[PDB]
Every structure is written in C-alpha cells, then in structure tokens.
Symmetry: D2
Subunit: 296 residues, 4 copies
C-alpha cells in the first residue's frame, strides 16, 4: 500500500413507543426542532467537525424516510450512506453495522437526538478530530447525570472511571453523545458482551480506551448548550431555545447548506440552486442572503 | 345525520425543511399529531363519519396512520386535493361523500379549547338548516375571513383577508352546513387569487339570511398551528394544561370512550401497545378513574 | 352583600433572590403584577369591597400601588399577617372587616381563566348560606387540599396535602363563605405543622352538610404562580392568549368598566398616563370597540 | 504622584411607562429574569470582567430599592456606590453623573437590561478590559439592527461607520450595551451636544474614538447569546432561556456569589455565611454545593 480520513456515523434508531403517538406518524429524528428535522442538528455537528462521509443507521422502515429527506448528500458536498438496524441492541452495535463503512479509517459517532450550541464549537470539535490515535469524548455538567454515561475525575482533573447510567453518580459530568474513535474501535466493539439490560454499551467501548490510557475526556463548558430532545417536554424546550436564538440573530443554528458553504464543500452557484425551490419561505430567503452578506 | 370533513391542505414549502421529513398535519403539537385536534373537535360534535382531504403525497400517510377509524368507533374515508386551489374545493372533492346529508368542515391546523366546547358544537350541529360559523376576537383580523356586525350584533358583511378589516372578529376554521353547500360550491367562480373561497360559500348563506354567526368567547382558546412559531406556541399551551391537570386535550381514544363509541374492553386493547409510555398509562387510568 | 379578601401571604425565601427586590405578588405574570389576577377574579364575582392581607413588609407596597381603589370603583382596605401561620388566619385578621357579611377569599398567587367564569363565580356567590369551593383535576393532588367523592359525586372527605391522596381533585384557592366562618376560624386549633388550616375551615362546613363542592371543569385553566417555573409557565400561557386575541386577561380597569363601576370618562382618565404603551392604548380602544 | 484600575458603571435607569403596569410595582431592572433580579446579569458581567468597584445609576426612587437588594457589595467582595439620575437624558450622561466616581481611571459601562451568555465570555471580556488605551465595543449579528447602534465594516473587517438606530442599517451588526473606555471618555462626554431626540448618545462617544483611530470593535460571535429584556415578550423569552440552561446543567447563569467565589474575592467561609439565610430554597442549596463540588 502507498500513501498520498475520519468518517461519521449518525445513530438515528427506533425510539420505541416512548414518544407515541407523536412518533406513530414519523420516527423521532424526523420530528422537527423548531423549523428543521432533528437529524439536521447532529448532521450539522459532524459537518462542523469537517466530516463529509457519513453513515446514517436507522430502522428498515425509517431508512427510506431519511433517504427521501437527505438523499446521498451530494447537493451539500457530502457522501451519505445508509445502513439498516433491525433491532435496538445498543449504541455500540453501530460499529458492527458500520464495520465495512469505517474500513481502516478514523471515525466519529453521534446520537441523532443530541443538539449542541456555542462559541468555538468548531474548535472544540477540531481538537477532538485532530487526535489521530485513541478516543475523545466530551464531559458536560448536568442536573441528572444518572440518565447518562458518567465520568469521574481525580483531584488533578484526570478521568479515573466511567459508569453507564449509575443510580449513584460519582459526579455531575455526563458523557455527551458525540464520540471520536481511532482504528481500534471496531475490534474493541467485536469483543463486547451485551450488558445486564441486553445492549452493546458505548460506555464499555470508552472504558476499554480509558484502561489503555487512550481516552481523552475534554470538558464541554457550561457556556455551551447541550440539550436532549427525547421527551415531549425537552423537544419543546429545545425548539423554544433555537427559536429564541434564531429570531434574535437572524442567523440559523445547524443549517446544513450554510455549513457546507462555509466549509467550501459547495460554492456560491450551488448554494443559489439550493435556494431556488425554497425561495417563497424564510429558509430559502436566508440561503439567498448568505450569498451577499458577510457573517463573522 | 351530519358528516365531517377535515381539510388537511398542502402548506407548499412554507414549513420546509420540517415538512420535507413529515406531513404538516402529522407534525406533533406537544405530544400528539396535529390532526388529532381537529379530529377530536369533530368527534366532540358527535361526528363519526369523517372524510380526510389532503395532498396526493400526504393522504396515504394519514390513511397509513389512522386506517378506517374502526378502532376508535369511527368511519374514516380519504380523498385527495390535487392542488391547493381554495378551501371551498373540499365540497366538490367531497360531494359524493356528503351525499344528501348535513356536513361540518374543520381545518387541519386549527386547535380549540375551553369550557362547554361540547355544548357550543352541539348547538351549531343541531341547526339542520342554513350554516353556522363562529367569530373570535383576534389581534390580526386581516389574516382571516372577517365578519362585520351592526349595532344590534347582526352579521352584515364577510371579507376574506381585507387590507382594511371592518372588525377584529375572525371566522374560525370550523363550519357547519346544510344540504345546500355542494350546489353553492359548484356555482362559485375563482377569486382574484385563483381560489374557491370558503368566505364566498359563507357569504352566499349570509345573502340568503341563513348564516348563523355565533361568538366564540374570549374564554375559549382558538389557536393556529400554520407557522413554526404558532406550532411551538400551541405545543407550550397544551403542555401547560396537560401537565397541570394530568388530563389530555384532544385524545381521540378518550373522546370515543366518553361518547360510548368504544367500550372499556376496546379502550383496554388500545392502551396495550402504548402501555410502556404515559399515553397508554393514561388510557388505562381512564378505565378506573371518574373524571367530571 | 359579599366582601372579598386577597391573601397575599409571605413566601419566606422560596423565591429569593427574585423576592429580595420585589414583593412576590407584585412580580409580573407576563405584562401585569400577579395581584391583578386574583383582584380581577373577585371583581368578576361582583365584589367591590376587598381586604388585601400581606406581610408587614409587603402590605405597604400594595397600598402604595393600589391606594383605596377608588380609581377602579373599588373599596380597598389593608391588613397585616405578622407570620405565615395558616391561610385560615385570614378570617381572624379580617374579622372586623368581614363584620356580619358574607365573604370570599382568594389566594394571591392563583390564576384562573375560561368561558363563563363569570357565571361559575356568580352561582357560588348567590348561595347565601354555607360554603362553596371548587374542585379541579390535577396531576399532583398531594400539594393541595384533596376532596374525595363517593359514587354519586357527593364530597365525603377533605385532606390537606395527603401522602396518599384519595383522588386527583384539588380544592382551588377560591372560597365562598357565609356568616359562620369567623366563629369556625376562632375555634380552630393549629395543625401538626403549626398552621390554622383553610382545609379545617372547609371540613367544618362539610361536617355540617353545608359545603358545596362544584367541579371546575377541565376547560378552565387554574394555574399556580408560586414557583419560578410555574410563574414562567403562567406568563407564557397569558402571553399566548393575549397576543392571539388582542384582548387582556385580568385587566382590572376593563372588568370595572364592564361591571359599570367606572364610566367611559373615568376609563379615559385612567388610559391617559399609560397612553404611550400598549396597555393605555388597550384602555383607549375599550371605549370605542364592541367586544362580546 | 507615585505608582505602586478599571471601574464599572451600571445604568439602571427609568424605563418610562413602556412596561406598565408591571413596572408600576417596581423598576425594570428589579424585575426577575427567571429566578434572579435583572440587575444580577449585568452585575455578574462586570464581575466576570474582573471589575469590583461599580457605580449603579438609577432614579431617585429606585436608588434605595437597588441599595436594599445589593448593599455596598462588601458581602460579595465588591465596592458598590450609587448615584441618582433625575432625568432620562441619554446613556452618555452616565459619564457626567459618574465623573467623580471614575476619576482618573479606566471604565466600563453596561446596560442594566442586557443579558449575555456563552463559552469563554470571561476571555472575550478580558481582552477588552486588557486594552489600557482607547475604547472597546462588541458587535453582534441581529435580526433588527435598526433598534441599536449599528457598525459598518469594510471588506477587510475594519469598522468604518457607526449610526444610532438607523432606519436603513448599513449592516446587521449591532453594538451591544457593554462598553470599555480609557481616561478620555469623560472629556469626550462633556463636549457632547444632545441629539435630535434630546439625548446624550453613547454612539457619539464611540464615533469620537473611531475618528481618533482608537476604537476596537470585537465580534461577539453567534455562539454567544445576547438577549434583550425590555419588552414583556423578550423578558419572558429571556426567562425561558435561562431556565432551560440552568435546569439542564444544575448550574446557574450570573449567580454573583459564585462569580465572587471563583474570582477569589470571597473565600469558602464567606460563601457559607451567604448560603445560611438562603438554605431552605434551591439558591442557598446551590451555594452550599459549590463549597464541595469541582465545576470546570
Ligand atoms: C463551518 C463553520 C465553521 C465555523 C463557524 C461557522 C459558523 N456557524 C456556526 N458557528 C454555527 N453555530 C451556531 S454552532 O457552532 O454552535 C453549531 C454548528 C453546527 C450544529 C450546531 C451548532 C452554526 O450553526 N452554523 C454556522 O454556520 C461555520
Ligand atoms: C365527549 C365529551 C363530551 C364532553 C366533555 C368531554 C371531556 N373532554 C373535554 N372536555 C376536552 N376538552 C378539554 S375540550 O372540550 O376543550 C376539547 C375537545 C376536543 C378537542 C379539543 C378540545 C377534551 O379534550 N377531551 C375530553 O374528553 C368529552
Ligand atoms: C365583568 C365581566 C363579565 C363577563 C365577561 C367579562 C369579560 N372578561 C372576561 N371574560 C375575562 N376573562 C378572559 S375571564 O373571565 O376568564 C377572567 C376574568 C377575571 C380574571 C381572570 C380571568 C377577562 O379577563 N376580562 C373580561 O373583561 C367581564
Ligand atoms: C470567574 C469566572 C471565570 C470563568 C468562568 C466562571 C464560571 N462561570 C461562567 N462561565 C458563567 N457563565 C455561564 S458566563 O460566562 O456565560 C456569564 C457570566 C456572568 C454573567 C453572565 C454570563 C456564569 O454565569 N458563572 C460562572 O461562575 C467564573
Ligand atoms: Cl464555558
Ligand atoms: Cl368567554
Ligand atoms: Cl369544562
Ligand atoms: Cl461564535
């Protein structure tokens, strides 16, 4: 072999019957947060990290619906592929479903219902994606760490334990649903035995890296918003939050067409074509405005 | 008898990209699809036989969701509006469904709430001649059909989206009609904006002295879910009432049960596949709790 | 005649640091001070003679804000509750105000809304014997006085904040009483938590067969503004109704005018100093607009 | 004179009758945003900038009310002074009212109803406060620039004009209500003639610095939230925003006691004393938790 890449995965799985009847009509990650499908937010997040080749994993039934929404990604300078997940057998199954997609490359895994926002988010992601070996996760202070993977730190700020959804959390630092992995993750994932609750657990993957001294735990500061979108109440809260920001600024959070344009993955002519069919609504008008307005 | 029509019309691209993923009237208002609210409204008026009109793309998605409605004691049919060429087109598309019966039409993105709403609908539906609409005081009457009243409270004009509204009373998206409505709709010409106007149907009744315009009081909430902002506001409004009360607004399973269109055993069957979430848990509680 | 009491009790430090700057019941719910809502409620029941009870610190601030109420056709008096030692203490503090008349008590942080609320209050106030309270289905009945009904709908028990509630029906913070209430309150002993309980007053009437418990339907909104979260929710709820309708909820100037306690010239005087904002503009519009 | 400071000003003036009747009961900057008086947010902002000596300017009637809330500041390691503003004669009057307070020192002026939030806000402020000469302002992209002072940039990103509330804005970049000044501002302020609308205008002060080549215009990025709190609707929106963040994180935005503690202006014993009278509510419980929890 001769030399002359980091690939993305969005787990947009079946949310069961938890949000029914809202979700009888459509899968969770197709429901909007304010003005855009939920999946726009994690997609935009991977895009901000510089990732163009992205696998979307969803149920057999939802796959064609995501495909209708997003296509192959080529209109936005992306290469979107799709894989079906028959059964909800944990998040780490992503690496077995996505094995041939990842191949010998670096990877990033993001949850389809996580929403992130803040200043220099691009730089926070960039430094995780820059580490070409080991694994990188983000820790975020929350009120309810028991709902998440929880990280414990020693007095010098070094991570010393990870626990999946502990009933007695060692700290208030939750591991966010955005993970950066090197080439070892698939082989780590293949050795996972399902948990007491019958799932292949992402926390076990992360603990394998930690045990090898190869896990970076970066703090995602309190000046960032990490919002969850998996209850009716939290989905509503997330929409209000985005609406308040966007209406204040006259700028959008997680507009994929914008992010592709600013990454130079598409050019001004291409953005104009995307603006055309959306011209009679605010979204297409927004895209048109980006062709002439300097936004810092 | 009175049959129901839900016009779940196409919103073009106004709600894109949200509506590139899911049909407009399948978008949730808080915890249930938008269409449950007008469905529940017709159900509260005692209407079991309902035509859902939508776009060629969305109509099959409503049908996949709701089926024939037998599970809720309903008789649901479907029809397609090829192009959004006016709300009054509902009566032409719905002509064979309506037949020789009385009808009611509700817009798919209209949400209603308040005390004795059941009685307000009952009074309209019991008039078996003429037409009955509701007037509601709004801040932005220019977005709607506007009804003008004289000093005695009699309705004297109707204007669709007037640049100079004659009052702040908007006609809500809920309309009751006798056997004349199909033939009135057949003899409409399109307006200046290429639409068969529901306001034109309503004016035809007004001109014959057969339009009843009842006030929907300020104690009722009439909300519009046609924009991202209004949809969001409607969600918060419902969430606040539901979380306060531990009761739902516009749960079709509940309304069917209270109308005795379905019995406790059927309500229990419906609760089963939703039993892992709060909605089935709510359906189950309805079997054992007295709610006045 | 029936006189009114607003108990604007001390919330201790529960709302600090917000309540280090301003009295709890002067905090705004959207666009007006909290106290306007219960004031408007009493006013809607036809009650013009109102005692405002509050803390030694807050009472003078209500008095500085509202004066004697003559500008709104009211007769307002003030009294102090030295320590928050139970809601029933209102009747002891208010004994000389009440005199030999009928009374009504409303909690200062309770907000009500809905269709024919005027009629619901009127029916309670017209009973000149016994007591009348309202039961409302809630999600968290353990935070309130809970009324238990038998199979015929008759109220059979009342419990204050039960660990095992017998129903989901909470007694709302609105109470109507005959001439017996002062002497019932005088013969109460403090509860296990050192409070003269309003639920104990209500049980004394229940034991004599003179408590009316009417259902406040699910079509009414009864909201609590006692926490930062509930206050915020109440604000959004009011804002949504007001911005939809272009009408206000619980504007005392409006209710006085509609009750004919003040006339158009007085309403016009009140609008003048607020004419630069939407509230005076609203008061001014009320002079020329028919609102049903 | 022998050698061996930047002072703060909060303009918490009379908001007229615009928010009545809510404000008949209390002045605008005493109204809460979610769980704390509005003034807590600009106060915390100056504190984050490292500023301890702060003048609060308000009406004769409101002065004692702010004084009851805040005292002299010494409980939080601050030196709070108060000056009365009889008449609402524009924002720049602050420098004439505050002349003897500023003396020969550097200054910062902040509006009592501006709310800011985001990652590395401390660093954004630090770099403005570090410039010991000239003036520093922040530009923020908004939907409605016509409500504010607006800054225009040339193609190289250099500020070339400032306009107060233009009916035809040159850009969407509003000047935020947070201003850093050197020793020249009082003398600049004394030469201001009132505007067409009878006010001493902050934009005229800023343009004087710009004309001297001494104005830095830093971009406040879209990852920061700058919210306005001066309508009933926006106050409500601001409260929802703070509530969503705080309830998500179990951390507070603009808790002054926290900021003083983290600045080391008060110590753990002093924070414990402040926690005591607030112990039965969430706020005092929060303060107690900060004595034992490491928050990054
Ligand atoms: C490619 C790129 C790099 C750096 C900045 C931007 C501008 N940007 C930003 N900052 C944001 N954010 C508000 S963000 O970094 O917090 C973000 C980005 C993607 C998804 C969620 C939030 C955005 O949504 N869209 C943008 O075009 C784009
Ligand atoms: C069949 C029936 C008749 C009268 C009352 C009720 C109870 N009810 C009510 N009142 C309501 N409302 C809160 S409602 O009348 O304002 C309503 C009803 C259907 C759709 C939207 C609001 C409801 O949503 N579901 C109910 O089962 C049901
Ligand atoms: C005196 C009067 C009697 C009947 C109706 C009205 C009109 N009205 C109504 N209905 C209301 N409501 C929306 S209400 O009855 O639900 C109400 C009234 C007072 C306090 C809270 C809600 C109102 O706030 N102000 C009014 O002037 C006024
Ligand atoms: C003194 C200090 C320096 C750096 C960070 C902090 C932590 N912090 C932060 N970041 C915040 N923010 C969320 S902030 O920088 O966006 C801020 C700070 C003050 C007022 C508004 C927002 C806060 O409110 N309280 C804090 O104690 C404190
Ligand atoms: Cl941060
Ligand atoms: Cl009404
Ligand atoms: Cl009801
Ligand atoms: Cl930014």
């Amino acid at each position: 072999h001769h030399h002359h890449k980091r690939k993305g995965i969005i787990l947009a799985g079946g949310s069961g019957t938890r949000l029914h009847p809202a979700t009888l009509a459509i899968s969770k990650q197709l429901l909007p947060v304010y003005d855009k499908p939920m999946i726009y937010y994690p997609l935009s997040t991977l895009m901000l990290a510089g990732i163009r080749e992205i696998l979307i994993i969803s149920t057999p039934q939802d796959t064609p619906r995501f495909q209708q929404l997003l296509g192959d990604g080529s209109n936005w300078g992306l290469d979107l592929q799709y894989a079906v997940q028959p059964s909800p057998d944990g998040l780490a199954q992503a690496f077995l479903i996505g094995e041939s997609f990842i191949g010998n490359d670096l990877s990033a895994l993001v949850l389809g219902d996580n929403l992130y926002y803040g200043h220099d988010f691009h730089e926070l992601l960039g430094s995780a994606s820059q580490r070409q070996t080991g694994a990188s996760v983000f820790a975020y202070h929350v009120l309810d760490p028991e709902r998440y993977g929880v990280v414990e730190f020693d007095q010098g700020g070094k991570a010393i334990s990870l626990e999946e959804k502990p009933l007695e959390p060692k700290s208030n630092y939750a591991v966010t649903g955005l993970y950066f992995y090197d080439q070892q993750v698939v082989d780590i994932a293949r050795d996972l035995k399902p948990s007491p609750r019958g799932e292949l657990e992402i926390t076990d993957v992360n603990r394998a890296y930690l045990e090898r001294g190869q896990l970076s735990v970066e703090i995602m500061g309190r000046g960032y918003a990490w919002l969850d979108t998996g209850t009716h109440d939290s989905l509503l809260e997330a929409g209000q939050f985005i609406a308040t920001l966007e209406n204040r600024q006259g700028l959008k959070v997680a507009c994929p067409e914008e992010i592709a344009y600013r990454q130079k993955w598409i050019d001004a002519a291409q953005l104009e074509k995307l603006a055309a069919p959306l011209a009679k609504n605010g979204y297409g008008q927004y895209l048109k405005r980006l062709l002439t307005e300097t936004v810092y």
